[PDB]
Amino acid sequence: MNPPPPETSNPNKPKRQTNQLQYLLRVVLKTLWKHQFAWPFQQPVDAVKLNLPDYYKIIKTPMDMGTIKKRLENNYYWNAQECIQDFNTMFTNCYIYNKPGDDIVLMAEALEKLFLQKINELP
């Protein structure tokens, strides 16, 4: 069975509208989203569909760009660091579960390089 996705709405969280948070959605996430290798990361890993019944026995904090996008849209992140942490969790989960040279690892490595380029300078 797939687990429920990470939470994306929480009215009790502290909330703020900042330039960097806006930039992380408008520029960083929305640009990564259009990359040719973004598709595996646009929604939670469907371990049932992908026949990966061990994925959610190994990965304990799942993360994906669809979840990140919903979080940004709900002002779930107080600051850019919290959002950047979720991107890094997403890449790290991929490198934990898979091995160097796997197609999915090549895809994540490409996206991570672009991500680091795009967050090198924030407003």
Ligand SMILES: Cc1nn(CC2CC2)c(C)c1-c1cncc(-c2ccnc3nc[nH]c23)c1
């Ligand atoms: C690329 C690719 N290649 N293949 C066929 C090759 C394996 C025999 C498959 C089934 C995929 C693929 C498709 N959709 C999502 C994922 C995925 C997304 C995030 N983390 C993952 N960890 C393991 N998979 C992950 C991967």
